[PDB]
Write a protein that binds this ligand. Sequence first.
Ligand SMILES: [Zn+2]
Length: 7
Amino acid sequence: GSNQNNF
Ligand SMILES: [Zn+2]
Protein backbone atom coordinates (compact mmCIF):
# COMPACT_ATOMS: atom_id res chain seq x y z
CA GLY A 1 0.00 0.00 0.00
CA SER A 2 0.98 3.64 -0.34
CA ASN A 3 1.40 5.78 2.83
CA GLN A 4 0.97 9.52 3.57
CA ASN A 5 1.86 11.32 6.84
CA ASN A 6 0.48 14.80 7.29
CA PHE A 7 2.23 16.06 10.32
ZN1 LIG B 1 2.84 -0.55 0.92
